[PDB]
């Protein structure tokens with residue numbers, strides 16, 4: 625063991641957190657989202673048509689400019705809530721800061737304009753389990769464990785607020801004590817295969833409203849917002865007094881700071897987010913509407929129904945993902 629490597633992340637306005645990786649010899653670089661909610665790796669491809677204008681506006685992998693390439697070409701499709709991305713598998717040598725692994729990844733040749741014209745990232749790196757991976761394709765953190773290079777079989781996340789500075793920082797093989805305070809509070813996974821833990825309550829003010837008897841909480845580094853079931857979120861947004869719109873929830877900007885705290889009850893402690901954490905205070909005007917960084921999503925079986933504690937949450941709490949001990953550690957971020 626003994627190794628620990630830390631990649632550095634750009635924060636596009638608290639909604640996209642991406643960092644650099646290389647593919648090939650010589651390396652071709654890609655801005656990518658590291659995603660505990662998924663297990664596959666992909667980037668856009670040469671063989672993407674120019675019909676897909678998402679591919680025009682992103683960096684493309686070219687197989688023919690890597691001496692380490694290893695054609696497979698098996699079809700791959702990846703479902704996200706905003707439609708799918710399709711491509712073919714291939715293999716090449718991938719660099720993640722200081723670590724280099726031979727990895728099987730997807731070359732996307734169908735990349736929709738919704739959502740990806742708004743995407744500052746090119747690709748995604750799945751940090752979930754092979755159980756979740758499409759194809760039973762060995763995920764990248766499995767292969768990094770296989771190497772016996774890491775100090776401990778863990779990785780961890782730091783998301784900062786967008787101040788205008790350090791955007792964020794993933795750390796493979798451990799955690800950065802400079803970006804959290806106190807010690808970790810650890811919570812064992814329900815089961816292997818999903819970065820998903822049991823939640824024992826969701827509370828507004830002192831009044832514990834929902835998940836009273838218990839429910840699951842997926843810990844999702846690829847998610848921008850906290851999310852819950854539609855029936856959970858409507859009961860939450862009713863309590864907060866937020867209006868719905870086509871796709872998000874809003875409040876009058878002047879009301880934001882007076883909104884109640886939201887507490888999530890995890891491994892015995894409560895994990896509190898104040899209106900400062902969960903609102904986008906662009907102004908404090910009565911004349912404007914400010915978005916809450918929370919929304920509805922009914923994640924299907926088997927993974928859901930479940931809450932997803934995305935970036936809105938991780939910003940406040942540094943998150944270690946323990947693959948050795950099949951648990952998650954939380955700690956007040958700084």
Ligand SMILES: CCc1cccc(-c2c(F)cccc2[C@](O)(CCCNC(=O)OC)[C@@H]2CCCN(C(=O)CC3CCNCC3)C2)c1
Pocket residue numbers: 639640641642657659661662704705706739740742743744748844845846847848849921934935
């Ligand atoms: C992770 C790959 C992905 C998949 C689907 C959509 C996007 C996407 C996009 F293409 C353009 C702009 C914005 C987004 C996102 O905001 C995520 C940005 C990255 N993630 C992050 O930086 O998190 C800290 C969505 C918006 C639609 C609603 N979203 C979700 O449902 C989150 C899921 C996305 C896939 N991974 C599991 C959570 C956020 C990205």
Ligand SMILES: *[C@@H]1O[C@H](CO)[C@@H](O)[C@H](O)[C@H]1NC(C)=O
Pocket residue numbers: 695696697698
């Ligand atoms: C693609 O990968 C699978 C391994 O599951 C294998 O069956 C197939 O032979 C591979 N094809 C090539 C061209 O490497």
